[PDB]
Amino acid sequence: MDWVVAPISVPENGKGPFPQRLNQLKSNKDRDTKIFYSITGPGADSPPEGVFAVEKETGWLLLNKPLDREEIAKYELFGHAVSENGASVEDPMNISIIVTDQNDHKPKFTQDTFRGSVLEGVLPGTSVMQVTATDEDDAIYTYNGVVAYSIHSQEPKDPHDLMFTIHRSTGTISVISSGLDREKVPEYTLTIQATDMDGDGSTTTAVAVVEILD
Amino acid sequence: MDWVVAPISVPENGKGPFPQRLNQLKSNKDRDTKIFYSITGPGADSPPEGVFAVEKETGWLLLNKPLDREEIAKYELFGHAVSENGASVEDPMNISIIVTDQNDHKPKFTQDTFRGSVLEGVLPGTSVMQVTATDEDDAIYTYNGVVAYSIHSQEPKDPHDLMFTIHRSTGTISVISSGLDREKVPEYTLTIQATDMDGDGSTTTAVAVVEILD
Numbered sequence: 342m343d344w345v346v347a348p349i350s351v352p353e354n355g356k357g358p359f360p361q362r363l364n365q366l367k368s369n370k371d372r373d374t375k376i377f378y379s380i381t382g383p384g385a386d387s388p389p390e391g392v393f394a395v396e397k398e399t400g401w402l403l404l405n406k407p408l409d410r411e412e413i414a415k416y417e418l419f420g421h422a423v424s425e426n427g428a429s430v431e432d433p434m435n436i437s438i439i440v441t442d443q444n445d446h447k448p449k450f451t452q453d454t455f456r457g458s459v460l461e462g463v464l465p466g467t468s469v470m471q472v473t474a475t476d477e478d479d480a481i482y483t484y485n486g487v488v489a490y491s492i493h494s495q496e497p498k499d500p501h502d503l504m505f506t507i508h509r510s511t512g513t514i515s516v517i518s519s520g521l522d523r524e525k526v527p528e529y530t531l532t533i534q535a536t537d538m539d540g541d542g543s544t545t546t547a548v549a550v551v552e553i554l555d
Numbered sequence: 556m557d558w559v560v561a562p563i564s565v566p567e568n569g570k571g572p573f574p575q576r577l578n579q580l581k582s583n584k585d586r587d588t589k590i591f592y593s594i595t596g597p598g599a600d601s602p603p604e605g606v607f608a609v610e611k612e613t614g615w616l617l618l619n620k621p622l623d624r625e626e627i628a629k630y631e632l633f634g635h636a637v638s639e640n641g642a643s644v645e646d647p648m649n650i651s652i653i654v655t656d657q658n659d660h661k662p663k664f665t666q667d668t669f670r671g672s673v674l675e676g677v678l679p680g681t682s683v684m685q686v687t688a689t690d691e692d693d694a695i696y697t698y699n700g701v702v703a704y705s706i707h708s709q710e711p712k713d714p715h716d717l718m719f720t721i722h723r724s725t726g727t728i729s730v731i732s733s734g735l736d737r738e739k740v741p742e743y744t745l746t747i748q749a750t751d752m753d754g755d756g757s758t759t760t761a762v763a764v765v766e767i768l769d
């Protein structure tokens with residue numbers, strides 16, 4: 342009884358010293374001759390070379406350097422078993438290395454300044470613009486690339502203080518208080534923020550400048 | 556050819572929807588009857604009950620909740636092959652789950668205010684005190700719980716702007732400049748900071764109060 346496929350899930354940007362052992366190969370029939378192991382493939386004997394390596398005698402698969410999942414996210418290697426007489430004993434076994442995500446990219450805003458506009462008498466609830474930011478990290482399986490949006494401050498304060506909201510996850514700045522007037526205040530400037538791990542991580546700052554129109 | 560041991564490495568505090576498929580069991584006795592798969596061990600039928608489960612007619616090993624490594628960092632379970640007559644077929648296979656760590660804990664100083672002191676006439680380089688922050692994440696195999704120390708600000712900014720420094724990894728504050736004097740400034744108040752992922756992570760802040768002596 343065994344696994345149908347056995348991938349090796351390896352957290353990226355890892356520490357300690359290298360090499361590191363990952364799993365150990367063994368062939369069914371190694372009381373026949375002595376067995377010498379070898380790995381091949383992209384990440385072993387093709388570029389990037391020398392990222393993975395196997396111990397000839399012991400069969401330990403080794404990690405040589407830390408992996409950036411944000412560069413290569415999975416490898417496909419092959420295990421080779423060759424007796425001391427030169428005989429390929431088994432078929433090269435599929436070795437699959439899945440690189441899992443650490444939170445090693447701060448979220449970075451689309452543009453340094455975002456510019457949008459709206460009109461004096463729009464009903465509370467009304468879209469005005471959408472900002473964004475990208476986090477190069479993963480957002481399907483981890484929260485490391487999932488972004489939360491917020492508004493820090495609003496200048497000028499004038500008719501109110503919470504003049505706008507931004508949707509936490511889509512980045513849509515709405516107006517929420519009727520009371521706009523282009524003559525009294527023509528150009529608000531929102532100081533906005535993107536925060537990875539869904540608000541519990543790093544925070545990048547940028548600005549959105551809403552102009553109110555006649 | 557196979558691994559002598561295939562643990563499953565599962566990033567903690569995972570996203571997406573659950574359950575989640577991890578690997579699939581299979582018995583090299585299934586070209587016979589229709590086998591039915593079950594699962595035992597702490598995390599399965601012991602406390603905490605129900606974190607893993609396997610689809611009886613597929614063998615897929617499912618994860619029901621997101622894991623917290625700092626709550627439990629490893630699981631040893633057993634999978635079971637039975638036919639329609641509850642008949643144990645081969646022995647139970649061992650399932651080893653290795654919860655890999657994410658940066659889900661901000662660094663916490665041990666006290667809000669460290670108190671130290673040093674004589675006015677000590678030489679530049681002279682140690683003074685050593686502050687400390689602890690991060691619950693792994694600092695062995697990952698940077699998530701590796702702290703980096705820094706002085707935010709010193710007040711009063713008398714005589715020089717920066718009279719002290721701190722070891723980035725050890726927490727030891729030392730004197731970097733000449734000119735302490737109890738008569739002129741008898742105490743300095745150092746805003747200290749601790750940042751995880753060895754600097755590129757989350758921060759909290761404390762203060763170290765250094766008294767100058769005759």
Ligand SMILES: Cc1[nH]c2ccc(-c3ccccc3)cc2c1CCN
Nearest residue numbers: 415439441482565566569575576577
């Ligand atoms: C619980 C968990 N964490 C993962 C992290 C990464 C990949 C993964 C699989 C194939 C290619 C690339 C990545 C799969 C998983 C799963 C199983 C959920 N289908």
Ligand SMILES: Cc1[nH]c2ccc(-c3ccccc3)cc2c1CCN
Nearest residue numbers: 352624628653654655656693696697
């Ligand atoms: C994040 C991470 N990566 C690993 C890689 C390997 C082993 C490991 C498990 C059993 C024996 C020897 C080593 C443990 C870990 C952890 C959890 C850190 N408490």
Ligand SMILES: [Ca+2]
Nearest residue numbers: 407408409412
């Ligand atoms: Ca790499």
Ligand SMILES: [Ca+2]
Nearest residue numbers: 622623626627
């Ligand atoms: Ca748990």
Ligand SMILES: [Ca+2]
Nearest residue numbers: 660692699751
């Ligand atoms: Ca941490």
Ligand SMILES: [Ca+2]
Nearest residue numbers: 656657659692
């Ligand atoms: Ca953690």
